[PDB]
Amino acid sequence: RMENELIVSKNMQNIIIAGNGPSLKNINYKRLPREYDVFRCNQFYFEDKYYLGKKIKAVFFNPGVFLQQYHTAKQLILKNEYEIKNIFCSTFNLPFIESNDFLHQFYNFFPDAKLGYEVIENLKEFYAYIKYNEIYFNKRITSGVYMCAIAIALGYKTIYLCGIDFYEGDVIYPFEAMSTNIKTIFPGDFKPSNCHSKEYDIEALKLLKSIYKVNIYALCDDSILANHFPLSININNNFTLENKHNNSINDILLTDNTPGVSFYKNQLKADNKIM
Amino acid sequence: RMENELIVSKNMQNIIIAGNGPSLKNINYKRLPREYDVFRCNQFYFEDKYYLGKKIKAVFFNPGVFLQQYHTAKQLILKNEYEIKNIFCSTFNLPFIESNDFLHQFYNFFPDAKLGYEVIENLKEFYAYIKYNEIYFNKRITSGVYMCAIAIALGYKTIYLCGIDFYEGDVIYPFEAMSTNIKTIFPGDFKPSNCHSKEYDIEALKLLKSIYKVNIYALCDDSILANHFPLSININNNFTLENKHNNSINDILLTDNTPGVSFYKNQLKADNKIM
Amino acid sequence: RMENELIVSKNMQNIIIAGNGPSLKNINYKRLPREYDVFRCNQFYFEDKYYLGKKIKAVFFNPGVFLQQYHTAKQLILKNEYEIKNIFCSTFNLPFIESNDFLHQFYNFFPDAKLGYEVIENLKEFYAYIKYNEIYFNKRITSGVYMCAIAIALGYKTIYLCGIDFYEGDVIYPFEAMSTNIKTIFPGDFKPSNCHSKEYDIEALKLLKSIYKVNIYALCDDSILANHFPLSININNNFTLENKHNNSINDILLTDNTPGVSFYKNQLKADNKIM
Amino acid sequence: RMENELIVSKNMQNIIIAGNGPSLKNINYKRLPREYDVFRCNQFYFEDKYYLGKKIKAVFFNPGVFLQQYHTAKQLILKNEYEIKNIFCSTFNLPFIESNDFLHQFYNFFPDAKLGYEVIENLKEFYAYIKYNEIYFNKRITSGVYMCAIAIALGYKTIYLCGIDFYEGDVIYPFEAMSTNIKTIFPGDFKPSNCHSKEYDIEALKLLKSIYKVNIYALCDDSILANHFPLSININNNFTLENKHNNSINDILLTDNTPGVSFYKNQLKADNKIM
């Protein structure tokens, strides 16, 4: 059971938004607010401990691996590894990014998931600005930034960021990113595309804050992000950091070649080749 | 004249749902409630007697033979063999099961029929669960189970099942299933696909009951089903079991090669080949 | 200027519906009611006199010659030959009759015309009955019958028919039907297809009358129709029968090969060939 | 930030509509009303001085160069050369003018732009008249006329025209129209197509005035237009005519070959070739 709609009440407008950078391991838990929902993205479940607990308000996955991630999320839920209230596909509704067939058939395959573009399109000014920069300049926001936009569109007012490290330093992930299954799905480093940049993520985040009037804090003392956004105040909060049981799902799940999966992958192949 | 909409009133929420297994011949009529509507599916009219009377609230047919079954149902009605209030196509809205063109043109060809998926999609949790199991695991519910889901979505509260025998024993149909017309339409046994299973039907039925809070009884004392669902109480009800007149329609009707039928079959061929 | 919507008021529910049979020349004008709207179809303007006056409430044209007839109607209007309040394309929304592209682009080309199927689809029982007979039996109603269905759907209550002669006798049209332009558009008799029949038109008309509870009269004393529907009562009405000026449009207009007409005819060719 | 909707209030219904003819240089500023919005089209920014000031209520661009003009307009705005409240694509929704894919994907690429046809389609009589003349007679209104129709549909009541000179005389543009970028985008005179005409523009403008009851004035004393529409009264208004800074954008901007631009141009090529 997912939520039918993600509704933010006026009484709790705090959101923690986590990337999967090394600083996920170095959160200052004293700086978390008393109440909050959590957003995670992509390979968050690769984490060896529950760095932000077991309750995820929404997870966010990219269209190119959505089939596998949707199944992985359903297994995380069934195996009681996490509680996941909503599942988004991080989308822009641009036909050189998401194929017509992918968008058309999305809800047919994933009836309880949500296309992210349907939420961020409501941020009119920000949405036009990201499309203009994508189309004409080949600049794209990362999932951390996307999740912020989604949070703002859904009516959260204070964002606390962590695991956002702009792919700098020698540790680039708090885990092995080139796991066996990642290698299989996309045959042969796992580094960001040229369309992504620290400067652009930062500009986009500053724009979200200036247009929509929300507050953005950092949580990780020793992270690059904290040089650009203020660390949240140490309010002496405590946290119980729990380990993952040993046979936790720790790699993206593969799918069996059923008639439906084969149909899906056939189509996805055909138009990923075109794009 | 079909009904425009199937509306269940609070005063009568009982539904009898019949498969076409051998136990259709062995209903304990004393266990039927006083009031009820009846759902039948597929080759129900192959029956040699009116095992559940002449008044069918809805019939349900699979997309692959819908053209012939729609015509057969219109002839059953015109020949006064049955009264049929509604006609559904048992559908899931998955493009590896029902082609885009089939779904797109459905109401164009069959303006007074109803696509079943438009009704079961409202059972959000159950609908997501059947799609997940279909796509990733190649498990599909049988029409008996589908009809239960439809009944629950339309607001029936108590289901009595019969003719559901999970394809076990040596009698598999209370009639000849490989009739001349069945053989012609689909050129050469008539046994269920590997995607269907007793275990899955049962799990899906138990899930419908636990999510939507309805009651499911059996009607056939000597049937496998009764080992999994309680027999309905013997309330001493009586039934007049009527024979079919001799020249009853007893096989699926064939269609003439008109411009419309040829157009339809041409298209259906083209994309059944793709799927 | 066409009407945006054809709205029938309770105070005037009379409609005269004219085919283009020989009996158009033999209307008994004494039998017309005091008040009425008029529907005409196809090559009505071939008439040498204004047999039903100059004011047409709606005209009805077949999809296969709609482009030329739309232009002809606009010229009839511009040249003050008739006043035409509405223009329909007599359609069923069946893809072996009207191509997907024709229906999709209809309003793009003809923004002030109306697709007839959008009106008759509201006659649920009658619409299902004509589709069933078209698809499975290759029986189609003629435009006279279609116009009756449209009238009934729009809320007219009494129909007076004329120019309906079921293609019987030696005079089949009160004019030359194989005119020069008819010959050109559709290169080489102008007789009805096998899908049309007197028996079916009559059955369909009797059905419209029994389902929707309206009255259908004849106006032509010496016509076949009057053997099946009652002649309207001689109420001593009078009529001024006016001649057409000599240079009246008397043949369907041809179109120039503009970029738009060529585009249109290219597409129409491509999928008339498929159908 | 564009406006979400262009809303005309009852208190200000005046619009200045400028073509890019030589008479843009010869506006009689004494004849402008006290209050007004301004519409400009196409290569307006080629102007060497701010002939109508810096505040544009809407700009209008043709589909065939929309990609470049949209980017040019965003740069005019970012560089503070103009303030542009709305951006329209001058469209008719005819598939031989605008491809299906162009219209389908329009808002995907340009989320804050507006398709003009969605506004002028509400002028029912005028819209049917321009489509009839386009399709059957290959007559098309120019952007000046289109902008008038848009203004009337949005509820402006008095139009003042300038820069409309029907491509007559020896000066045809108050600037070089065959600039380097114009030459590149559309490889090798810049004169109007045969579908455009002074007579038709004038007839269409007179029709807008007679159907929708608005007033149309001229502003340029020595222009052809003033022989067909009355010059606005000299009310002794004054105007500060400002020069453009030297490094003003003065040619249409070219786009970089990003994945999105290449995708877009690939598609546009494919179906401009078909049309």
Ligand SMILES: CC(=O)N[C@@H]1[C@@H](O)[C@@H](F)[C@@](OP(=O)(O)OC[C@H]2O[C@@H](n3ccc(N)nc3=O)[C@H](O)[C@@H]2O)(C(=O)O)O[C@H]1[C@H](O)[C@H](O)CO
């Ligand atoms: C190879 C490839 O495709 N790498 C991309 C990567 O360029 C980036 F597009 C992103 O991010 P991904 O690395 O998974 O990590 C999630 C988020 O954590 C933050 N982060 C992470 C590590 C780090 N050192 N500094 C950081 O700031 C970023 O804000 C990022 O959005 C993404 O969606 O933005 O997704 C991955 C994959 O497409 C994805 O993992 C498939 O499931």
Ligand SMILES: CC(=O)N[C@@H]1[C@@H](O)[C@@H](F)[C@@](OP(=O)(O)OC[C@H]2O[C@@H](n3ccc(N)nc3=O)[C@H](O)[C@@H]2O)(C(=O)O)O[C@H]1[C@H](O)[C@H](O)CO
């Ligand atoms: C060859 C083939 O395609 N067999 C399938 C069969 O695997 C099964 F998919 C089903 O069922 P079908 O056998 O017609 O019978 C209808 C229902 O009766 C119940 N039943 C029947 C016999 C039995 N011994 N034990 C039972 O439990 C099942 O719940 C079933 O759903 C179906 O839609 O579920 O449909 C048929 C045909 O596609 C259909 O007849 C075409 O018109």
Ligand SMILES: CC(=O)N[C@@H]1[C@@H](O)[C@@H](F)[C@@](OP(=O)(O)OC[C@H]2O[C@@H](n3ccc(N)nc3=O)[C@H](O)[C@@H]2O)(C(=O)O)O[C@H]1[C@H](O)[C@H](O)CO
């Ligand atoms: C060759 C061809 O295609 N003939 C068909 C004809 O079979 C018939 F389909 C019809 O009728 P069409 O003859 O024009 O005449 C209009 C109506 O007048 C009535 N009538 C006419 C003559 C007659 N002797 N007895 C009659 O009853 C019929 O009710 C008919 O519907 C039609 O749409 O029903 O349309 C024409 C053409 O497709 C059309 O003219 C193209 O513009």
Ligand SMILES: CC(=O)N[C@@H]1[C@@H](O)[C@@H](F)[C@@](OP(=O)(O)OC[C@H]2O[C@@H](n3ccc(N)nc3=O)[C@H](O)[C@@H]2O)(C(=O)O)O[C@H]1[C@H](O)[C@H](O)CO
């Ligand atoms: C080569 C080509 O395609 N020329 C066309 C031209 O035939 C005409 F279609 C138009 O007009 P364009 O010349 O740009 O000028 C804008 C408007 O100013 C008015 N005017 C201009 C000059 C003049 N001497 N007398 C005038 O009356 C007209 O009302 C016109 O609508 C148009 O959209 O109507 O657009 C251009 C281009 O397609 C456009 O510039 C691409 O960005």
Ligand SMILES: [Cl-]
């Ligand atoms: Cl996989």
Ligand SMILES: [Cl-]
């Ligand atoms: Cl058949």
Ligand SMILES: [Cl-]
């Ligand atoms: Cl022609």
Ligand SMILES: [Cl-]
């Ligand atoms: Cl370019």
